[PDB]
């Protein structure tokens, strides 16, 4: 067998606590090299301490091959142990029938293994629920809607910035434009959100800042006055909550804006500033050489987000900064009852801070949702002591690549499988899936205005384990290239809205919330049934939901389903190129 | 190539911060399958943000194959980056010359890789020294001596337990025997320790407890009165410190003894006890059925260490228990200036507690040494936020197995290589290497009283990266089977001491402290030079120390070294079976 392809990392996503007496264990092997895996497991102390002749290694537990990423196969088993201590090893058999035991001590013939020595085995030493990953259940039933507040709705012309342009969803906005969107506009259109069926709003930053996007924070403790005030934000959160809609705000803690009191004090007082060590300043005075691009300097004497001199990086290892940021994070939860924080550039802040943040939030709200913005693999933030989830850009990016280009269905299924096996099962269900955002081109533009393709992408994404999000205006087919063009004023004129797409998105949201969210502990299965043809199944003990996606260039015929939930062709059996069909069937 | 055998786990022992601008990166591949590995790495934002034509991926960095465990090869490189943000990927070429790029997105031909997208790469997002592993430098120069205080020296008959037996190192002690050893006895023999050359004392538990081993704690805040009192312990620590000897105490925090105030309160008051939730009680009253073995019950209604009813497990997730234990840990450091804590059964206490413990200790003493007793792989406790090191029983156990049985030298070198590549390089230098202890048979008994074999085992262990420890009496050749027989009264009668072994151990301690500890940033190399013949090299930029060990059944001839440090044969060129020779040479 391919022994170099076999690996088990103890105390990780491959061995973790699910409840006081139960653990999940995984093994990686080389694809199709290993025929079978059994787990030998039990209480380490039982081997020598108990007077019985029975030994735990005499009754193996079968492991199941659950996924493959094209390189490796992944196997899993759930183990229950009342003594809440576990020693375990793997019996692996390859395609030629060669069997070995694999343990913390390496690879052995069974006859050579020291099975009576507890230290031979991998260990889960005591099942610690304080250390385990917990998923908040309310997120399961959520469909999110992301609002970039400058561009959603102007409900109050009297707070508009100087130079505000007329509201025109056909504009191509520049980087410094204002259209006057604000919190009253969101309040004004809560009926639209409830009619669409969404149950969570994600706001981009709303705190005082000079820009239209407000990531260059001036004051974290004040709603930007062009958006509203504290009273209005409280009214908005209560009105959302009354409609069953949770609220997630954007925490911009990696850097502060250069018009903040703190940075302005550094510019006035240099190293004598009380805030000098709140930042990462290499040489005083803190300076840079301006260029023709506001957002770029080649030589700032302080660390920044990217290379923009207007966003000095915060020193989150400084205990005064930790206290400042934790007080901000507490204030908005305690005084306004928000339900979640989305963490901007969360990977560039240290784990020590995020553990303190996690502890503070869970002490306020044990079901709080902490969402990190990270575009690469995120295992070390998703153990259960830092974030709940991340924005799942690697996963939706792979979906986009499949639908928009011409890779094989095998390639896509390999990539999604790889992703899921990076994380604990409950973590995968908390991941935040959005196909586009204020940082990407719009879906309808990526699809070259092919609405059928856009519907397929959205439906495929809405069938995945993670929770889906709709970027404002997707439901009417808004177009746009990348930032700033993906931030057009929301389309409120009916002549300019795609009503068919809105109707479709209402139906899709209903399949997600009424069917997919209501299965119990389901299994997801990816089947490649032909060239660019995929069958996705989610199933529990009672019911199976199946979606077939034909993204080749030929017609596909399927058996007429008894209960079709959603389809694009008028036929109940034939799928043309880029059609899909979702149905439900009982499990037999 | 064997792609299933290639793996890089970001933010782990394969990618970690060594200082503000420097990181160490590792890759695993299948043994001898990959010919070369280059790293492509640089600031993620530099790709699109900088106006230059240069891109970081145009100048690869060569990685070096540093170890092999017989299954996998391990490659390493050190990278410096002034922007303190790193994106990286690996260029791997197999034995047939097939080259691929391996990144967070998987495996690609170079021509197909999206090298301009920062999200293609693995990431070290910002170099966080607050999250990094730190090794205390004083441990580098230490050789430890482990004292089981009941059995080292009786310096005060007036505190002896009732039934104390006459001091006789030829006795076979029973599990409940007392010989009257105490803290005054240790004070009385500090000259012996200084003459041997040791610079750290590890004491087994000294707090009030009814047994001879005192792991069944009655009161953590009081020195056991058969050992001494607070004044005497302060005198002992100051006297040790005056001689350049650090002091490590045993923290028994996984369980408490059943004669403690807390457990006795549970027995009196059942669930109405203020301490009921300090424990893991499944059913009240807390009870068990006694057996003929004091240390075993089959049905205790509360969790215990092993199956002994006298050691109820502490609930370290309870904040009252956390506070109690942290106060104890603080008290002995603050009031008595101890230098380290050894943590008994440390794996069965939760990571949340150990992070709080770590933070508390480092705030008192930034160079504190935290040593966990764990007999299996310990990666998740050695990241830099919990322990400094563990008792390195997997490593010394492999050494013992080689010298005492007849496996190949390749097998041993594979096992040691596997061990070292589990951990960060600095961690490996902090590991605590003892060949025997109060929990194992004695070295001289394992060696069947073959003193030459015992000398080889000790010398081989003392050349390893971790810090060595001598269990009391090893230096005079004490014998003993496992506990309780490994706890004989210390041999103080000269007629019964092996003076040749004591002389040898003085010389060996001097090679460790004067030569091996004084190299700068050295490399360790394991060479198998013949059947059961091993050449161990440690070398820095100026000097190389080489040890050759002949453990076959034939003579071995080596070149006459110019500067021999330590050898067992009278010859300067010939090694008989089980001889060794250590020398030093300049690096050319
Ligand atoms: Ca307005
Ligand atoms: Ca005494």
A230 at B interface, C-beta within 8 A: no
Sign of the alpha-carbon dihedral angle for A331, A333, A335, A336: positive
Placement of tokens 């992944």 in the chain: A74
Taking a C-beta distance cutoff of 8 angstroms, is the pair A257, A311 a contact? Answer: yes
**Side-chain half-sphere exposure of A291, counting CA atoms within 13 A:** 14
Give the DSSP per-residue string, A472-515.
Answer: TTGGGT----STTTT-PPP---GGGS-HHHHHHHHHHHHHHHHT
Interface test with A, best of B2, B5, B395 (most A CBs within 10 A): B5
Q: Look up residue B551 and give its two tokens.
A: 């453990």
Ligand 1 mean position to A230 CA, how many Å?
16
The answer to whether B412 faces chain A, any CB pair under 8 Å, is no
Tokens 């563990």: give the residue.
B390
Interface test with A, best of B2, B3, B4 (most A CBs within 10 A): B4
Phi, psi of B25 (to 5 degrees): -125, 135
Of A5, A124, A347, which to mutate for an interface test with B (greatest number of B Cβ within 10 Å)?
Answer: A5
Q: Measured in whole angstroms, how far is the alpha carbon of residue A314 from the centre of its chain?
A: 25
Query: Distance (Å, rounded) from C-alpha A103 to C-alpha A415?
Result: 29
Task: For residue A576, give Cα distances in angstroms to A123, A443, A567, B543.
Answer: 53, 21, 11, 74
B123 in contact with A, Cβ within 8 Å: yes
Ligand at minimal distance from the CA of B186 is 2
| A147 closest CA partner among A487, A501, A498 | A487
Residues contacting A194, CB < 8 A, separation 6+: A243, A244, A245
Interchain pair A348, B85: CB under 8 A: yes
Helix and strand totals (H; E) in chain B: 13, 27
Residue A304 is given by DSSP the state B
Task: Among A107, A128, A317, select the one facing B350 at the smallest CB separation.
Answer: A128
B354 membership: H or E segment, kind and range: helix B351-364
* Coil/strand/helix, residue A401: helix
Q: What are phi and psi of B440, to 5 degrees?
A: -135, 165
Domain CATH number, residue A34: 2.60.40.10
Cis omega (within 30 of 0) for bond into B484: yes
> Are A182 and A159 in contact, with CB atoms under 8 Å apart?
yes
CB contacts, 8 Å: B33 with chain A: 4
Q: How far apart are the C-alpha atoms of B532 and B552, rounded to whole Å? A: 5
Helix ranges (DSSP H) in B422-515: 425-430, 443-446, 451-462, 499-514
First to last CA, chain A: 36
Q: Which residues of A touch B11 (CB under 8 A)?
A: 379-380
Residues of chain A contacting residue B281, judged by C-beta atoms under 8 Å apart? none
B518 interfacial to chain A (CB closer than 8 Å): no
Q: In sequence order, what are the residues at sequence separation of 6 or more whose Cβ sits closer than 8 angstroms to the Cβ of residue A55?
A: A42, A46, A47, A115, A116
What angle do helix axes A451-462 and A499-514 make, rounded to 10 degrees? 10
C-alpha to C-alpha distances, A250 to A202, A214, A328, A362, B198, nearest whole angstrom:
8, 10, 12, 18, 57
- Measured between beta carbons, the chain B residues lying within 8 angstroms of A69 are 106
Beta carbons within 10 angstroms of residue B180's beta carbon: 23
Measure the CA–CA gap between A206 and A223, rounded to whole angstroms. Answer: 6
**How far, in whole angstroms, is CA B228 from its chain's centroid?**
29
Instruction: Write out the two tokens for B567.
Output: 């050898």
How many whole angstroms separate alpha carbon A567 and alpha carbon A575?
A: 9
Strand positions, DSSP E, A20-104: 22-30, 34-42, 61-62, 64-68, 72-80, 86-94, 99-103
According to DSSP, residue B189 is labeled: T
Domain span at B32: 3-131
DSSP assignment string, B374-438: -SS--GGG-SSSS-SEEB-HHHHHHHHHHHHS---HHHHHHHHHHHHHTS-HHHHHH-EEES--T
Resolution in A: 1.7
Q: Do A349 and B126 touch (CB under 8 A)?
A: yes
Sign of the alpha-carbon dihedral angle for A22, A23, A24, A26: negative
**Ligand 2 center from residue A410 Cα (angstroms):** 75
Judge: A123–B376 Cβ closer than 8 Å, yes or no.
Answer: yes
How many A-B residue pairs are in contact by the CB < 8 A criterion?
A: 146
Establish if A415 touches chain B: CB-CB under 8 angstroms. Answer: yes
Q: Which two tokens stand for residue A180?
A: 């006057």
Assign 3-class secondary structure to B304-325.
Answer: ECCCCCCCEEECCCCHHHHHHH
Three-class SS of B359-386: HHHHHHCCCCEEEECCCCCCHHHCCCCC
Does B352 lie at the interface with A, CB-CB under 8 angstroms?
Answer: yes
Instruction: Please answer whether residues B220 and B185 qualify as being in contact, where contact means their C-beta atoms are separated by less than 8 angstroms.
Output: no
- Closest residue in B to A45 (Cα–Cα): B306
- CA–CA dist B58, B62 (Å, integer): 13
Per-residue DSSP letter, A119: G
A180 vs A489: CA distance, rounded Å: 9
Q: Are A153 and A188 in contact (CB under 8 A)?
A: yes
CA distance B301 to A440: 58
Contact B10 A380 (CB under 8 A): yes
Query: What backbone phi and psi angles, to 5 degrees, belong to A380?
Result: -70, -10
Q: Which residue of B has its CA nearest to A9?
A: B379
**SS3 call for B440:** coil
Of B313, B200, B232, give the one whose Cα is nearest residue B266: B313
Alpha carbon of B242: minimum distance to chain A alpha carbons (Å) = 36
B2, B355, B376 ranked by CB distance to A119: nearest: B376
């Amino acid at each position: 067998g391919n022994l170099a392809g076999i690996m088990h990392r103890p105390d990780s996503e491959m061995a973790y606590v699910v409840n006081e007496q139960t653990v999940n264990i995984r093994l990686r092997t080389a694809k199709d090299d290993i025929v079978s895996v059994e787990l030998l497991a039990g209480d380490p102390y039982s081997l020598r301490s108990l007077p019985t002749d029975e030994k735990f290694y005499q009754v193996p537990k079968q492991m199941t091959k659950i996924m493959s990423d094209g390189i490796s196969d992944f196997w899993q088993v759930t183990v229950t142990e009342p003594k809440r201590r576990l020693a375990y090893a793997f019996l692996v058999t390859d395609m030629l029938g060669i069997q070995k035991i694999y343990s913390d001590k390496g690879f052995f013939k069974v006859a050579d293994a020291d099975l009576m020595d507890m230290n031979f085995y991998f260990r889960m030493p005591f099942f610690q629920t304080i250390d385990q990953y917990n998923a908040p259940e309310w997120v399961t039933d959520t469909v999110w809607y992301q609002i970039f507040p400058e561009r959603f709705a102007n409900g109050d012309v009297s707070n508009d910035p100087v130079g505000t342009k007329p509201w025109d969803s056909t504009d191509h906005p520049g980087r410094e434009d204002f259209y006057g969107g604000d919190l009253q506009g969101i309040l004004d259109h809560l009926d639209h959100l409830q009619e669409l069926g969404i149950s969570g709003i994600y706001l981009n930053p709303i705190f005082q800042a000079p820009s239209n996007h407000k990531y260059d924070t001036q004051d974290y403790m004040t709603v930007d006055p062009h958006f509203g005030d504290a009273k209005l934000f409280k009214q908005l959160v209560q009105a959302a909550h009354e409609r069953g809609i949770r609220v997630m705000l954007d925490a911009v803690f990696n850097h502060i804006g250069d018009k903040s009191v703190q940075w302005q004090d550094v510019l006035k007082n240099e190293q004598a500033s009380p805030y000098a060590d709140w930042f990462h300043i290499h040489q005083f005075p803190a300076t840079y050489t301006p260029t023709d691009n506001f957002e770029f300097a080649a030589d700032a004497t302080y660390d920044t987000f990217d290379y923009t001199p207007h966003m000095p990086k915060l020193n989150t290892s400084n205990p005064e900064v930790v206290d400042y940021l934790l007080n901000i994070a507490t204030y908005w939860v305690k005084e306004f009852d928000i339900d979640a924080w989305r963490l901007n550039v969360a990977n560039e802040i240290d784990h020590h801070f995020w553990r303190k943040f996690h502890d503070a939030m869970m002490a306020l709200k044990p079901d709080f949702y902490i969402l990190g913005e990270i575009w690469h693999t995120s295992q070390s933030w998703l153990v259960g002591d830092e974030f709940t989830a991340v924005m799942n850009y690697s996963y939706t990016g792979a979906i986009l690549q499949y639908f928009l280009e011409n890779e094989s269905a095998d390639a896509l299924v390999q990539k999604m499988s790889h992703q899921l096996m990076l994380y604990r099962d409950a973590t995968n269900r908390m991941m935040f899936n959005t196909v586009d955002s204020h940082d990407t081109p719009r879906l309808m533009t990526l699809a070259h205005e092919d609405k059928q393709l856009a519907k397929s992408i959205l439906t495929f994404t809405f069938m995945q384990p993670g929770v889906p999000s709709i970027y404002y205006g997707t439901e009417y087919g808004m177009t746009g290239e990348n930032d700033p063009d993906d931030r057009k004023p929301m389309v409120w004129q009916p002549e300019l809205q795609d009503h068919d797409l809105y109707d479709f998105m209402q139906k899709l949201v209903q399949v997600r919330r009424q069917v997919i969210a209501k299965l119990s502990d389901d299994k997801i299965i990816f089947d490649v049934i032909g060239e660019r043809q995929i069958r996705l199944t989610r199933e529990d003990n009672q019911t199976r939901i199946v979606g077939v996606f034909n993204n080749g260039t030929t017609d596909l015929t399927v058996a007429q389903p008894t209960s079709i939930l959603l389809k694009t062709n008028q036929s109940e059996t034939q799928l043309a190129p880029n059609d899909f069909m979702i149905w439900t069937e009982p499990v037999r």
